[PDB]
Amino acid sequence: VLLEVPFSARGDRIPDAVAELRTREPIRKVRTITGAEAWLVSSYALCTQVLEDRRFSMKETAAAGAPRLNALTVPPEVVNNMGNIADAGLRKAVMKAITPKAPGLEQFLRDTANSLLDNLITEGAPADLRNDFADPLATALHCKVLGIPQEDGPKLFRSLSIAFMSSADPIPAAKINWDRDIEYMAGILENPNITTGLMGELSRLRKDPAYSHVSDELFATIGVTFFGAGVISTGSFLTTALISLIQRPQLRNLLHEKPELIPAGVEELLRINLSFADGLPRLATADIQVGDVLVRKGELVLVLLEGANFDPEHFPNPGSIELDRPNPTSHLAFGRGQHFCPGSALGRRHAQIGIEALLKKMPGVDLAVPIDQLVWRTRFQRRIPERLPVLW
Ligand code: HEM
Ligand SMILES: Fc1ccc(-c2ccc(/C=C/Cn3ccnc3)cc2)cc1
C-alpha cells in the first residue's frame, strides 16, 4: 500500500522510520486520512524550501476540490486568517497584544503556575500535569491575554478537543462549537467592561473610523482563533516538554540547580517536540521542483516538522538535548516564512515560566506510571497524553 500518514500518535519518541525516509526519500508520496495523495517532506533543506516559497500556499489548501490532509474545522475563509488580519491593517495591534512583555503578564503566569502546583501538592500524588497544570495554565494565560473573564476559560477550552481534531470528514460538533464561540466573542466586543488585552484593543479599533469597514466577523474570528491556537499549542507543548524533561533526570536536575539555563533548555525542548501530529499543509500553485520531485500545480505538500528538527545534517546528534548548540533557534517548531507563528514569544514564555515553577515546587517530579501507559490522543492535530500522572 501507499505509505499512510501520520505514522504514530505517540509524542514520546520519534519513529525510526522518519530517519530512513529522510535519508532515502526526503520528499515521498503518502496517503492522508481522507484518501488523498500528498508529498511528505522530511529534511531540513526541503522543509525550509517549501515554507519559504509562498507558491506553496496555505490559503489554497481550503479550495473546494483540493486534495486534503483532513477536513476543515473552520470556515474556508478563516484558513487565510492571518492574511485577513494583515489586509485589515490589524497585524501590529494583534502582535502588541500577545507579547509576553505586557505589564504584569509574566507575574500573572508565575502566580497562576505556583497556585496550580500548590493545589496539587495539597491534594497529594499522583497528579495529572496535563489536565490539572499545563492546560489550565495555558487557558488562564489566554484569558488574560484576550482580556476576557477567567471564569469563561474552561467552557472555551472544552471546544478544543473537537476544534483541533484531524478528521477524514466534517465534524458537526466543530461547527456547533465554532458558531457558539464566535457569538461569545461578538458579545465580548459589545461589552463595555472589556478594556484590556487583545479583545479590549479590538473593541476599541472596531469603533475607530480608521478601521470602520473591518467586519464584525473578522474581529470575533480573531478572538476565537487566537484563543484556540494559543491554548492548544501552549498546553500541548508544555505537556510533552514535561515528559521529555522527566525522561531526562540529569537535565531535570541541572535546570533545577541552574534555572538560568531554562530558556536554553526550552529552546531544545521546542526543537525535539513532537506536538504537531501532521505535517504543515500547503497546496502548490505552480509546478515546482523539490529535491528529486517535480511537484505539480494543485498537489498537496506536507512539511514534517520533526523531519527538519531531527535532521542530523543541521542538528548533529539530534536526539540529544544540548544547551550550547550554535544554531539553537533555527528549528522549525514555530514554522518558517510567511506563516511563522505570531505567538512564538508568548509560547516560549509560557513554557519557561511553567517549567521554572514546577522544578522549584516539585524538584523530584517523576512519572507515576510506566511511560508506555500514557494514552496518546488519536486523529488530532496535536500529539498529547490524555493524562500525565506524576509523583514527586
Ligand atoms: C509552544 C507554543 C506554540 C507552538 C509550538 C506553535 C506552533 C505553530 C506553528 C508550527 C505554526 C505554523 C503553521 C503553518 O505554517 O502551517 C503556527 C502558526 C500559528 N500560531 Fe502558533 N504555536 C505556539 C503558540 C501560539 C500562541 C501562544 C498563539 C496565539 C496566542 C499562536 C497562534 C498561531 C496562529 C494564529 C498561527 C497561524 C499563522 C498563519 O496562518 O500565518 N501560536 N504556530
Ligand atoms: F469550535 C472551534 C473550531 C475551530 C477552532 C480553531 C481551529 C483552528 C485554528 C487555527 C489553526 C492554525 N494553526 C496552525 C498551527 N497552529 C495553529 C483556530 C481555531 C476553534 C473553535
- Say how far residue 290 (Cα) sits from the centre of its chain: 26
Measured CA to CA in angstroms, residue 49 lies from 27, 46, 257, 282, 368 at distances of: 12, 5, 40, 12, 42
Contact 274, 241 (CB under 8 A): no
- Ligand 2, CB within 6 Å, residue ranges: 73-74, 159, 163, 174, 177-178, 181, 224-225, 228-229, 233
Q: What residues are paired with 385 via a beta bridge?
A: 376
Site residues for ligand 1, CB cut-off 6 Å = 58, 81-82, 98, 225-226, 229-230, 233-234, 237, 275, 280, 333-335, 339, 341-343, 346-347
**Contact predicate 331/315, CB 8 Å:** yes
Which atom of ligand 2 is the closest one to the Cα of 180?
1
- Alpha helix segments (H runs only) across the chain: 16-24, 44-52, 81-87, 91-97, 105-123, 135-146, 153-157, 160-163, 172-189, 197-206, 216-246, 249-257, 262-271, 305-309, 344-361
Q: Contact at 8 Å (CB) between 281 and 61?
A: yes
Contact 332, 218 (CB under 8 A): no
Q: Which of 182, 225, 305 to mutate to test the pocket of ligand 2 (most atoms within 8 A of CB)?
A: 225
Which DSSP string corresponds to 298-333?
T-EEEE-HHHHHT-TTTSSSTTS--TT-SSTT-S-T
Name the phi and psi angles at 370, rounded to 5. -55, 145
Interatomic CA distance for residues 220 and 186, integer angstroms:
5
Angle between helices 249-257 and 262-271 (to 10 degrees): 150
Nearest ligand to residue 380 Cα: 2
Q: How far is the CA of 98 from the centre of ligand 1 (A)?
A: 12
Contact 212, 199 (CB under 8 A): no
DSSP state of 131: I
Which atom in ligand 1 lies closest to the alpha carbon of residue 142? 30
Q: List the grid coordinates of 165.
A: 481534531
291: left (phi over 0), alpha (psi -120 to 50) or beta: left
* Nearest-angstrom CA–CA distance, 247 and 301: 33
Q: Which three cell numbers stand for residue 324?
A: 550550547
Supply the DSSP string of 330-390, one letter for each residue.
-S-TT--GGG--TTHHHHHHHHHHHHHHHHHH-TT-EESS-GGG--B--SBSB--BS--EE
- In total, the chain counts a number of residues equal to 392
Phi, psi of 295 (to 5 degrees): -70, 135
CB 3 within 8 A of CB 30: yes
Angle formed at CA 181 by CA 176 and CA 186, multiple of 5 degrees: 130
Experimental technique for the deposited model:
X-ray
Q: How far is CA 348 from the centre of its chain?
A: 11
CA 216 to CA 379: how far, in whole Å? 33
Place of cell 526543537: 271
Q: Are the C-beta atoms of 153 and 143 separated by less than 8 Å?
A: yes
Q: Of all protein residues, whose CA lies closest to atom 16 belonging to ligand 2?
A: 229
8 Å CB contact between 6 and 280: no
- Measure Cα distances from 267 to 10, 48, 140, 388 in Å: 21, 19, 23, 22
